[PDB]
Amino acid sequence: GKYVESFRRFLNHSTEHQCMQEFMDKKLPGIIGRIGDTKSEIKILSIGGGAGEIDLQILSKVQAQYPGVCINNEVVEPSAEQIAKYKELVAKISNLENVKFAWHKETSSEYQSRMLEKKELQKWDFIHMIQMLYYVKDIPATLKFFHSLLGTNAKMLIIVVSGSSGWDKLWKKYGSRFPQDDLCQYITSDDLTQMLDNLGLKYECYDLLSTMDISDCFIDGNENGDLLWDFLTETCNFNATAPPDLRAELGKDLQEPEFSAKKEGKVLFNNTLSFIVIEA
Numbered sequence: 001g002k003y004v005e006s007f008r009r010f011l012n013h014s015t016e017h018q019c020m021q022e023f024m025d026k027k028l029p030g031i032i033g034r035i036g037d038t039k040s041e042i043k044i045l046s047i048g049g050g051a052g053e054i055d056l057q058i059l060s061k062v063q064a065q066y067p068g069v070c071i072n073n074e075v076v077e078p079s080a081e082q083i084a085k086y087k088e089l090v091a092k093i094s095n096l097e098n099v100k101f102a103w104h105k106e107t108s109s110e111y112q113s114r115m116l117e118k119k120e121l122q123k124w125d126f127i128h129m130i131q132m133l134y135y136v137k138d139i140p141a142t143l144k145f146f147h148s149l150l151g152t153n154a155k156m157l158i159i160v161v162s163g164s165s166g167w168d169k170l171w172k173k174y175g176s177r178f179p180q181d182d183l184c185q186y187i188t189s190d191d192l193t194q195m196l197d198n199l200g201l202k203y204e205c206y207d208l209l210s211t212m213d214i215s216d217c218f219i220d221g222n223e224n225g226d227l228l229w230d231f232l233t234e235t236c237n238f239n240a241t242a243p244p245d246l247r248a249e250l251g252k253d254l255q256e257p258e259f260s261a262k263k264e265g266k267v268l269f270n271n272t273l274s275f276i277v278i279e280a
């Protein structure tokens, strides 16, 4: 329950969705410019679609490119809370008339296992996995599987933090000191591009600057600041349980240019995102 609420707090204190919106406005149109060619139905598969904000922006661009074409947007999302929010959002929208939504409460692995419980693999015209590969156990198998589901002229979009983000510096230096867990992998676009290269898949990668306002993290007692610390360290009650020296060290590094930039009296952690477009 806190994972989702924690992520929402992060979104509320970062330009993440704004960054993605910038990408969807500037780059997506060209990227999805042919996924619907010759088709009377466009199938979009959203893996880890969460609350649906980005999914809906993606859909608006596809609808704009293919007016009148029915769009089937299927979502693989294991969080009931996320699905509920997603449905709430859709229920408020009226400018997505050619779209049919379907929500499957399951992980991508369960989805994968099941689709493989049939005779024919279902093909898709656009598949996206936005900010969710960190929670997949077997990334190479996941990448290979979903790529295999791409139909003609289809594309797969994956988004994760960039190897040049502050996350990369944080994980490399403090990674081992943080609570390790297969449930969450510390991967960046560098890890993903290497896996894609080894898989022999063709792709294009675009990096976009994004920031996480961690100003409150330097205000002791600050509720938001403390919850963001938990987020950054993926440790519940970090300031209340972490070693006084580790906390002191982190507080210092998170202020360095390698991790953040200081402007307008605020500390902006480098949240540069990588948008990877994989070809069928």
Ligand SMILES: CCN(CC)CCC[C@@H](C)Nc1c2ccc(Cl)cc2nc2ccc(OC)cc12
Pocket (backbone or CB within 6 Å): 003, 004, 005, 006, 007, 134, 135, 161, 167, 180, 181, 182, 183, 184, 185, 186, 187, 231, 234
């Ligand atoms: C760039 C940072 N990003 C990727 C590592 C992760 C932020 C993770 C935060 C939100 N916590 C999360 C987790 C933390 C620890 C472990 Cl063991 C498993 C986790 N699973 C999560 C699944 C969904 C989620 O979205 C609703 C957030 C999660």
Ligand SMILES: Nc1ncnc2c1ncn2[C@@H]1O[C@H](CSCC[C@H](N)C(=O)O)[C@@H](O)[C@H]1O
Pocket (backbone or CB within 6 Å): 007, 047, 048, 049, 050, 051, 052, 053, 054, 076, 077, 078, 079, 082, 106, 107, 108, 109, 129, 130, 131, 132, 135, 136
């Ligand atoms: N194994 C898995 N397969 C599919 N989705 C998963 C998953 N593990 C976690 N998720 C989902 O991955 C999402 C990560 S946060 C997603 C945010 C959304 N794509 C957007 O960018 O705003 C959450 O909604 C979470 O429940």
